[PDB]
Structure 1
């Protein structure tokens, strides 16, 4: 428990990288988060909007 300042720095940088990776699963309003899935479902001009 005494080393909490150093463990906190290790924890914060791990949590920031895990959050950055988990944001690849988000849609942001698109039909899918998987990029090849969009390109399989849709025509060229519609896929570009997604």
Structure 2
């Protein structure tokens, strides 16, 4: 019974911690990349994310 709780919590923690990954973008923060790149390149950067 403890393993079900542990596995569900771990999967959710991994899912949330996946928002810290760049995936090749200049930055992982959408607002940060949008605030300093013009649209036709910010589009490309956002698409990878």
Normalised to the residue count of structure 1, the TM-score between the two structures is 0.88
Instruction: List structure 1 runs of 4+ shifted beyond 3 angstroms.
Output: none
CA RMSD, 1 decimal: 0.4
Q: Which runs of 5+ in 2 are unaligned?
A: none
Shift of 1:32: 0.4
Normalised to the residue count of structure 2, the TM-score between the two structures is 0.90
Aligned residues: 45
Q: Which of these two proteins has the greater Rg computed from alpha carbons?
A: 1
- Larger relative CO (CA 8 A, sep 6+): 1 or 2? 2
